[PDB]
Design a binder for this molecule. Structure first.
Ligand SMILES: CCCCCCCC/C=C\CCCCCCCC(=O)OC[C@H](O)CO
Ligand SMILES: CCCCCCCC/C=C\CCCCCCCC(=O)OC[C@H](O)CO
Ligand SMILES: CCCCCCCC/C=C\CCCCCCCC(=O)OC[C@H](O)CO
Ligand SMILES: CCCCCCCC/C=C\CCCCCCCC(=O)OC[C@H](O)CO
Ligand SMILES: CCCCCCCC/C=C\CCCCCCCC(=O)OC[C@H](O)CO
Ligand SMILES: CCCCCCCC/C=C\CCCCCCCC(=O)OC[C@H](O)CO
Ligand SMILES: CCCCCCCC/C=C\CCCCCCCC(=O)OC[C@H](O)CO
Ligand SMILES: CCCCCCCC/C=C\CCCCCCCC(=O)OC[C@H](O)CO
Ligand SMILES: CCCCCCCC/C=C\CCCCCCCC(=O)OC[C@H](O)CO
Ligand SMILES: CCCCCCCC/C=C\CCCCCCCC(=O)OC[C@H](O)CO
Ligand SMILES: CCCCCCCC/C=C\CCCCCCCC(=O)OC[C@H](O)CO
Lengths: 305, 305
């Protein structure tokens, strides 16, 4: 029984991750619909999370990390990957239906397995190449039938697969190396990442968008409602990422990506219902085949030498 | 020397393979321009090779093979792969510029390594997945900028990668298992394949297209000139494939496919010049990156366990 309640405790982290992430995705897309500034919005989301984390430390509500030069050095690559994936995915969100962005990002486990096997010196059974056929075909069919398709929206989402996988792998290194450091709990690892990532993205966001005026592109929406929407999705952006690092603490980076693909089925189903996204038969079939393929790919990589 | 004279003789076979195949590709596309019946034309090409081989046997110009029940059984899957790839590529030739057909088929060595590793039980180094990025990106960019792109022309060419790789691997097994059968020289192996393949394709060609009228769609071409064009490309279709089986007899199925990609660079350059194919900057760049990635894939696969 205790082993089962532990898995139920870990599974509950996954639920919270999915639950916060769905609330975030809906509110984030609604923010972008009336305030199309992906660079500044994504930077604000990191800043809100950075501020939230410092207050927890200041108030003594969260253990303060034993910060060292060795730890900051070991978090640069996790923060580089987080910043790039965050800015790329927000750009994708701003250009296409977010259901499509998540279809592209559903192939994350393949990038995760390749990067992890590269680092671990593992080899791939040839049958994993066979499972690439439905993955590549499914994404290609999904993109070719996606009504909101743009090349930049597709490529930024694909780039985020690479950035987040490096983040997850390098973050997993650090969490294992500092496993004895009782103060570096999972939330503190992500807390330091969102602080570093904020200053990493801030100069770029100011360069390409400056200071956008707080004006809704949807007529009739007050500035108070727009500001509230920015803060709301910024809060849940941080909460889902923070809880996800508890999940990352408990699984391998590849299992974390498999957990992300399961998350994305939920986000895709939820977002197309909330936004009444038009979906043709071929688009349904392409996206479903792509996601079946990445699961079969993970199944093949796991069950073969 | 004795190994060197052999590699020079083999190198001369590769030259005839490339030379005959270029003459074939030009004439074949000119015939399809006048007479757009890929099923019947591809079936005729197998039959002319069948007839050419039987005349060599009847006139005592080539040793007759001792055909046995076991040999025929061993040549069914080679003939299935040959028939399918032949009909698929000819269909592709008739729908798009043949330079684009060969760009898609330039990824053949990837299909070759996978199928070869599937049978041999080898595993793939993680770096080979990284080389897939320029391959997928280059083929996608090429397809997205190809003036003559059709989905059918792209898919039939991609399917031919699977069929021909199946043909090469199963043919290589047959040639190895029957190496001690002195009458089964490389040309006799392909001769039997083109006979079986002809009768495999013949019923489908009649069902698909019936008996096409021998009338040129291009003005000023008599029936005799159209007939002569059909025989001409049929002769060099057989000559390039027959000489290619001497190459296959002396190299691995993967090395054969790598030799095919080198051939396709020559065919692409020559066909765009002969046909004055419009090629934009992005299209040349995509096609070059796709073929560069295939050679990098082959390098990573060969240079890493
Ligand atoms: C222009 C970049 C601003 C970066 C500052 C982020 C501070 C986050 C808090 C509120 C955002 C203001 C709405
Ligand atoms: C293990 C998962 C297996 C099957 C679920 C496949 C997921 C089914 C989700 C299909 C995606 C979809 O609904 O398509 C919407 C479209 O992408 C809007 O952009
Ligand atoms: C295993 C590879 C999976 C590939 C998925 C194929 C789906 C094809 C669906 C419609 C094509 C015809 C529509 C017109
Ligand atoms: C293992 C990881 C797999 C992930 C890799 C998946 C493979 C994606 C390949 C090609 C998609 C890009 C081609 C896009 C398909 C056609 C869509 C399109 O370009 O449509 C025209 C557009 O509407 C006009 O702007
Ligand atoms: C897994 C299923 C995912 C559904 C998740 C939330 C339901 C959201 C539906 C919102 C109802 C539409 C409101 C307009
Ligand atoms: C319709 C396109 C033109 C069709 C061209 C005819 C194709 C079949 C001819 C001969 C194969 C029969 C093999 C006979 C081998 C006999 C060898 C022997 O003499 O013993
Ligand atoms: C061996 C390595 C070769 C590298 C360069 C090969 C790249 C040359 C490929 C030809 C590019 C090209 O001409 O594209 C034509 C276009 O596809 C019209 O269909
Ligand atoms: C790694 C292979 C990636 C291939 C990238 C090809 C470069 C295309 C760049 C810009 C096109 C924009 C049109 C102007
Ligand atoms: C080993 C790897 C083998 C190579 C794997 C290659 C994967 C390429 C993926 C998709 C190509 C097709 C998608 C791009 C098609 C966009 C062009 C397009 O659809 O344009 C509309 C057309 O003009 C009107 O029919
Ligand atoms: C009418 C038919 C005319 C027949 C023309 C074929 C001539 C030589 C075949 C070349 C193949 C040479 C390779 C064999 C190996 C040496
Ligand atoms: C290696 C490149 C091979 C190119 C061969 C091209 C031959 C003739 C084209 C002359 C143009 C005819 C008009």
């Amino acid at each position: 029984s205790p082993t089962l309640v532990h898995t139920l405790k870990v599974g509950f982290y996954f639920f919270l991750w999915y639950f916060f992430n769905f609330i975030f995705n809906i509110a984030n897309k609604r923010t972008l619909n009336m305030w199309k500034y992906p660079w500044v919005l994504s930077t604000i989301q990191l800043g809100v999370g950075a501020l939230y984390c410092t207050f927890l430390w200041v108030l003594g509500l969260r253990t303060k990390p034993n910060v060292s030069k060795k730890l900051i050095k070991a978090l640069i690559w996790p923060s580089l990957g987080h910043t790039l994936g965050h800015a790329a995915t927000c750009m994708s969100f701003s250009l296409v239906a977010i259901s499509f962005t998540h279809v592209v990002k559903s192939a994350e486990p393949v990038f995760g397995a390749v990067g992890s096997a590269l680092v671990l010196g593992e080899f791939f059974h040839p049958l994993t190449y066979l499972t690439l056929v439905p993955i590549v075909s499914g994404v290609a069919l999904s993109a070719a039938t996606e009504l909101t398709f743009t090349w930049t929206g597709f490529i930024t989402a694909m780039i985020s697969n690479v950035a987040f996988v490096t983040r997850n792998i390098t973050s997993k290194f650090t969490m294992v190396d500092f496993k004895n450091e009782k103060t570096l709990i999972a939330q503190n690892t992500y807390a330091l990442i969102t602080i570093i990532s904020f200053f990493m993205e801030l100069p770029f966001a100011l360069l390409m968008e400056g200071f956008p005026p707080l004006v809704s592109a949807i007529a009739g929406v007050s500035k108070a409602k727009l500001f509230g929407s920015i803060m709301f999705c910024s809060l849940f952006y941080h909460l889902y990422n923070e809880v996800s690092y508890l999940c990352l603490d408990n699984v391998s980076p590849v299992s974390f990506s498999i957990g992300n693909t399961i998350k994305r089925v939920i986000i895709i189903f939820g977002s197309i219902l909330v936004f009444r996204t038009p979906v043709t038969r071929l688009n349904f079939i392409g996206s479903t085949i792509a996601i079946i393929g990445t699961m079969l790919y993970s199944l093949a990589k796991a069950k073969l030498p």
